[PDB]
């Protein structure tokens with residue numbers, strides 16, 4: 490059996506230190522890592538956030554859950570595959586550690602954020618919410634056209650958490666378990682960019698008006714949503730060669746969707762999904778950075794100055810894309 494060898498290899502491995510694995514670095518790249526090494530990095534994230542000890546996760550179970558999460562990404566989807574989920578979780582770990590966010594959060598919040606980061610795009614089909622709506626997908630019907638994909642990712646997350654041998658939350662008390670699942674749902678839903686756009690104004694205004702207070706539960710929840718977005722988008726902050734390579738993957742995925750829209754919907758794709766108009770990429774990247782990314786990384790730096798490297802990297806990529814666009 491093939492998946493058994495994977496598990497036995499993972500569970501038998503000594504997990505290298507976070508220092509060795511370079512996972513505290515906001516500039517981290519996964520490109521040179523094997524799948525087994527990404528799994529070992531994930532075990533280290535749970536370990537160094539004190540989650541294994543605290544919640545008494547059995548090693549074999551954590552290993553199985555990680556491998557189940559990885560298997561439930563679609564490997565041939567160009568961008569939304571396990572490496573994107575892994576990178577998102579690594580950004581979350583770096584923000585908590587290097588970015589000094591950890592001590593602002595509870596143990597349950599940290600547990601939920603890590604699980605959510607890893608699970609937030611599970612079973613992604615490589616097409617957008619709008620595409621699912623337009624092709625009358627049953628998922629869109631079930632979820633009333635609202636955060637369609639994200640509902641599905643959450644459903645998948647729960648399925649894996651409940652699967653025999655994978656129950657990494659089986660040790661929590663009833664009140665802790667309830668609380669954790671609620672946070673996970675909110676965290677995964679927050680990764681719908683439409684929800685980020687809807688809610689970010691309140692976050693930015695709280696900050697601007699000197700009203701931001703993490704002791705307020707509603708504001709804590711809002712902050713967690715923003716932090717999820719920040720991690721989900723973090724490829725846009727990476728050193729140029731890394732960001733360029735990842736941007737090519739996203740383009741491949743999006744252009745694939747446009748091809749499907751021409752065939753299935755008989756419509757010209759929007760520029761973002763139109764390979765015929767790939768000349769628009771630089772200008773679209775600048776526009777995305779300016780409209781969606783910069784304000785978020787600026788706000789995050791306001792919350793914790795040690796998150797500044799995300800903003801610095803974002804600004805550097807803006808400059809590089811704009812040099813291409815102009």
Ligand SMILES: CN1CC(=O)N2[C@H](c3ccc4c(c3)OCO4)c3[nH]c4ccccc4c3C[C@@H]2C1=O
Nearest residue numbers: 724725732735736739740743761770773774777
């Ligand atoms: C909805 N939406 C809008 C959008 O404009 N983008 C960007 C982008 C910009 C220009 C592009 C592009 C993606 O693909 C084709 O040309 C963009 N740039 C990245 C760099 C790295 C990783 C993901 C992205 C995305 C993802 C992101 C997105 O999800």
Ligand SMILES: [Mg+2]
Nearest residue numbers: 609610680681
């Ligand atoms: Mg998503």
Ligand SMILES: [Zn+2]
Nearest residue numbers: 609610680721
């Ligand atoms: Zn994502």
